[model samples]
Target: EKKKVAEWLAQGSIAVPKLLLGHYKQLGLGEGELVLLLHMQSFFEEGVLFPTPAELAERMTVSAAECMEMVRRLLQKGMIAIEEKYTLEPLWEKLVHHLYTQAAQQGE
Candidate 1:
């Protein structure tokens, strides 16, 4: 039954999108832009991981304008602290893991 449920969801292109809204805020994102931070976290793990905004949008059923708005939000909120344009990978992982650990207990 578990597998059946999973298969059905997968068949429908359903995606389990996670957004660490509160976690992003705690990391210094302004409270006023929590939703934008949420979108940033979602885009990184979902879009960046998949390596394309279009893929993420297809899976999530959102528009390009929405994704760009999310990028703007992240930049404005300080959720994405880019030291240099190309040095974001390490920061991205650190931020994601930090948020992930906050949401649940990780296995050692």
Candidate 2:
């Protein structure tokens, strides 16, 4: 049944690279985009490097074209790497910097 399907997927562990996503607003990421990035991160961890827009959209339940646009935006910001390997290092680094800045300001 559908319940079994959900249970099966839920049983799989998806590693989280980081949780700095709480400051996604400061990173100029919209809700949908942020979730999309997380999905990409999951894909990265699952060993599906550089998954196509169609593949990503299929998993996210989004239109492939729309997914491509979102991916494109991330690429422009250097957040989604597609060179030799796909990575969210740029996104994580930016988030870390922003997190530090916030902590530093609060320290005063």
Candidate 3:
């Protein structure tokens, strides 16, 4: 049986940023791309530093090639920047800006 949203959340799953989920699609990310980000965020939370594409694929059940493609898409869109340290600051900043913009528009 499928679990309800609340049930899934109650099971100690990784915490995805609410802002990220709320804005990723508006920022032109696909669902798979979002899942890729979630895995990366989870690794960060676990103090895993970074996981290789192969490792991510194995965990996510996607092919290594597909994982690499998703990473490329994220990078090209400025949603993430990968180096020695993986960075998603740009994504967060954009999401915050969007929220503030929406709020300001409402005040108009």
Candidate 4:
């Protein structure tokens, strides 16, 4: 007994926070940056650790320069890592903070 979403899904699947998807712009991620991050995270899950801009750009509609710039911005933003083994915990921590910030407001 077989169905769809078997082969491709087997390649990789990332567990992303719905909040991050919903409130990423407020977390300082530009539209382009968010998608690029997804591609990065996707490859990371596939054991790429850190995919180069050239690799990411081909998967994107923009140029490698544009992709590199966003990668730079993301690295500076401190959400996506590049100086070490690489991990996405920074963004997750920020998302928790984002939730707390909204909850702390509590006036809305």
The estimated TM-scores of all candidates read 0.33, 0.76, 0.75, 0.81
Per residue, candidate 4 scores C-alpha lDDT tens digits across 1-108 of 245567666665666668988999899897777778788788877788877899999989989998888877877888877554567778888888988999889964
Compared with the true structure, all predictions reach lDDT values of 0.49, 0.78, 0.81, 0.81
lDDT of 3 by residue, 16-105 (tens): 778777777888888888888888877887776567787778778689998988888788888888767788888887788878887899
* lDDT of model number 1: 0.49
> Residue 63 of model 3: what lDDT?
97
Residues 12-104 of candidate 1 have per-residue lDDT tens digits of 332322444335445565543444334345556543432333443454445756655655555554445554231234435656877677667
In model 4, which range of ten residues has the least summed lDDT? Answer: 1-10
Select the stronger candidate by lDDT from 1 and 4.
Answer: 4
Which residue runs of candidate 4 sit more than 4 Å off their true CA positions? 1-12
Clashes of 1: 0
Q: Once superposed on the true structure, which residue ranges of model 1 sit more than 4 Å away at CA?
A: 1-52, 82-108
**Model 2 misses residue 40 by how many Å?**
1.7
